[PDB]
Amino acid sequence: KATRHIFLIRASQYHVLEKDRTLTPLGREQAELTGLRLASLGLKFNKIVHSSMTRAIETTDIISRHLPGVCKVSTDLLREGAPIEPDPPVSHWKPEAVQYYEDGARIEAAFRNYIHRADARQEEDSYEIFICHANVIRYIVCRALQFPPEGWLRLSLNNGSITHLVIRPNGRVALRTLGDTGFMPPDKITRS
Amino acid sequence: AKATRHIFLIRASQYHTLTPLGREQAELTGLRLASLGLKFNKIVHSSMTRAIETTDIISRHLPGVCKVSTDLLREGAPIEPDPPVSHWKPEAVQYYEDGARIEAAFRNYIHRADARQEEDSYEIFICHANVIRYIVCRALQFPPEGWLRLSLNNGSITHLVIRPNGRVALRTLGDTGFMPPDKITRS
Amino acid sequence: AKATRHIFLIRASQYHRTLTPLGREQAELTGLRLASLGLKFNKIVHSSMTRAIETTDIISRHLPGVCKVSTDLLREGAPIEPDPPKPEAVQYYEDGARIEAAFRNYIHRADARQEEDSYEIFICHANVIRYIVCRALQFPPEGWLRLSLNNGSITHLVIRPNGRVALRTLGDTGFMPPDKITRS
Amino acid sequence: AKATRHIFLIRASQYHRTLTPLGREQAELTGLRLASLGLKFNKIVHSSMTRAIETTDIISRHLPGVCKVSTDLLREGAPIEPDPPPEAVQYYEDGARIEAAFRNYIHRADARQEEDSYEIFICHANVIRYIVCRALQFPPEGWLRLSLNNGSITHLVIRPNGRVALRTLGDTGFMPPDKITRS
Amino acid sequence: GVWDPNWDRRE
Amino acid sequence: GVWDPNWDRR
Amino acid sequence: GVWDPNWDRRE
Amino acid sequence: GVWDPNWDRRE
Amino acid sequence: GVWDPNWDRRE
Amino acid sequence: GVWDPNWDRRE
Ligand SMILES: [Mg+2]
Ligand SMILES: [Mg+2]
Ligand SMILES: [Mg+2]
Ligand SMILES: [Mg+2]
Ligand SMILES: [Mg+2]
Ligand SMILES: [Mg+2]
Ligand SMILES: [Mg+2]
């Protein structure tokens, strides 16, 4: 009966040990802007589910400041990884078969557990924020639209961008926006 | 082919010709495009009234960018969507002609840079919802029948990048983050 | 669909990309002929290429009050690899799609809205017209280069309301003095 | 083969039997046109049908000194059942005859022929349309998808490599519109 | 070779 | 390349 | 629909 | 889902 | 080698 | 019932 609005937010620009892979100052500004935008949409968000990676945790802290009273939830399922071998293959980055073997199962589990039509027990349209990472979100988008998942690398997502998926109670999926950063000043938009 | 092509597909603003809100939307889209700090090569636009109006408003913020009209980018029915929508059922003749035309648009405008192109290009294509979504599905080599699995707001910016080796990246789809939420529409 | 469509496909006159002096004289001869046919033409659709627009202007002088329309669909191109055989494949890939779109949108039986017979003038280019003709007759399109059209020529297609197609003239330039007939 | 063959297939003018008065006028206009092209014609091959002989005589006055030749092969008939839609025997008989006409008259130049030839073939609607479909290697059953005015000029070019170009079909631009007929 | 009567749809 | 209506089994 | 270069048997 | 590198005929 | 009775299209 | 030596992708 309900429709689910899924807002996938990519972590802001960060420093490239994971613990020391924290947001850059520009990343802080980007997350600040994203929080401003989310707060200005006038929506009552149900949850902020976020990856357990440092940069996702920090982007979540900043965004959560603008959405007081929104439940926060941590997940290992949403951590960044290598979902499937991309086609066409990209040569600078080429993970080992083990990374596909592990991360594909984990990220596919994430897609199946979080991307679905509302449960029949659901009362009203939901508005949910998912703060995670580039590869994860791109794979989620390919899977949700039932496009070949090997094409996740055909997408590109700016830091702090908002990707809006809509799942109607009949299971149909609409991608209403991908990589939205129009709310950021152009000089502060990054992909890395 | 050494240059990269940046294609900005803009959906026509809200219409009944443009509504008052639609004209405001085109104003916002033009402001954003001009504030990106890019030197645009051309504005290719559908020859439909609302496309001409959106182009007129946007062009004021990008004076001196060549403008081009085309019938190829006019709105139409590219192919039967999958899954079916039972609120919109054009006839076979419409798919037959409009698919040929929209596919011609895709082939003529979406490609890697010509060998003679020396510098990266930034090009604006102002057209329509179905055309843009079909263009997007084809450029990414996704099943075109899924063009209706996408949704585009009025005046939104869709950023496509074509690398000189033929690789295609969808940098953004339906971007309207530059408009006040209360001014965003799909119809 | 109770009306019949008469389609007059005119090839652009000689050009260099403006018309040559001879090309303009050719366009004048074509316009005189069209005006002397004793027909009331509904529209003039023309390619947006320079020479097509110039030939259209010249012809339009003799057809006062006839609606004029420009299209990118009718611009010259390489529709398919001719058989028997040289452009690059990218050109076939782009131009074939566009020329086929032109054919599908402009060559068909009369629409239900059309009650009376129409006479329509299409000013384009050699390859476009020849491809249109091969398609309209349901002849193998790969043979479009087995046809040849002089500059300023008139090709008369008739599409009957039941979808049947008759080619009544192809490449007619008998109205031009032989010393002014050219193919390039 | 070294030379190129230029073939002018001309439909007999309007007739009743013999030519109508308008038919005679049409044949006169066609002869005028051919004489005004500035070509030295090699031969005039014509069907042996009354109307073909009449159009040939009229045209011939304007091209005197051009060899005249008669053929029964070029006589009118029904070559094939057209697609889209005469007893089966007429297709059976006339198809063989018109196919023979096509094979004997439409081909690349003989190797001995040194200079380009320009030949006029005065015959009939069905024969010419079938000839054109065959020469272009288009489906012959589509011969009825073409239409030819009385006295019209159809120009075929056969290059010494056997490739064929159709330059004009049913040309009557040299006639005043009020004198153009198809029957 | 065989005419398609629905070449333009519209049949 | 055809849409599955039961992708989420729901 | 392949062009036959020997249609007239004179190649 | 397997990419054609000659999709635009400019490879 | 079997005789066709409609050889002349007149059966 | 054959053992896969690369079950964990680490050979
Ligand atoms: Mg902070
Ligand atoms: Mg990330
Ligand atoms: Mg639109
Ligand atoms: Mg031309
Ligand atoms: Mg050809
Ligand atoms: Mg006759
Ligand atoms: Mg004729």
Numbering used by the authors:
A (entry chain L): 95 to 110, 114 to 289
B (entry chain K): 94 to 109, 119 to 289
C (entry chain J): 94 to 109, 118 to 186, 191 to 289
D (entry chain I): 94 to 109, 118 to 186, 192 to 289
E (entry chain V), G (entry chain U), H (entry chain W), I (entry chain T), J (entry chain M): 56 to 66
F (entry chain X): 56 to 65
Publication passage describing the model:
Phosphoglycerate mutase family member 5 (PGAM5) is an atypical protein phosphatase implicated in a number of functions within mitochondria, including organelle homeostasis, mitophagy, and cell death. However, unlike most PGAM enzymes, which are phosphotransferases or phosphohydrolases of small metabolites, PGAM5 dephosphorylates protein substrates, targeting phosphorylated serine, threonine, and histidine residues. Between the MTS and phosphatase domain, PGAM5 contains a linker domain with a centrally located “multimerization motif” that potentiates PGAM5 activity.
The asymmetric unit of the unit cell in our 2.6 Å resolution structure of ∆90 PGAM5 H105A/MM revealed organization of the phosphatase domain into a dodecameric ring, with the MM peptide positioned in the lumen of the ring at the base of each phosphatase domain. The dodecameric ring in the crystal structure of ∆90 PGAM5 H105A/MM has a central six-fold symmetry axis that better matches the C6 symmetry of the 2D class of the ∆48 PGAM5 ring than the C2 symmetry of the ∆54 PGAM5 crystallographic dodecamer. In the ∆90 PGAM5 H105A/MM structure, residues R152, Y108, and H230 adopt similar orientations, but in the absence of phosphate. The on state observed for ∆90 PGAM5 H105A/MM in the absence of bound phosphate underscores the importance of ring assembly for stabilizing the active architecture of the catalytic site. We also observed a notable difference in the conformation of the C-terminal region of the MM between our ∆90 PGAM5 H105A/MM structure and the previously determined ∆54 PGAM5 structure. Although an identical length of the linker is resolved in both, the improved resolution of the ∆90 PGAM5 H105A/MM structure and overall quality of the electron density map in the linker region revealed a register shift in which the positions of R64 and R65 in the ∆54 PGAM5 structure are occupied by R65 and E66 in the ∆90 PGAM5 H105A/MM structure, respectively. In ∆90 PGAM5 H105A/MM, R64 is positioned directly in the center of a dimerization interface mediated by the α3 helices, expanding the network of interactions in this region. The guanidinium group of R64 in monomer 1 is also involved in a previously unobserved cation π-stacking interaction in trans with the phenyl ring of Y198 of the adjacent monomer. Although such structures are not present in the crystal lattice of ∆54 PGAM534, the unit cell of our ∆90 PGAM5 H105A/MM structure reveals rings stacked to form tubular filaments.
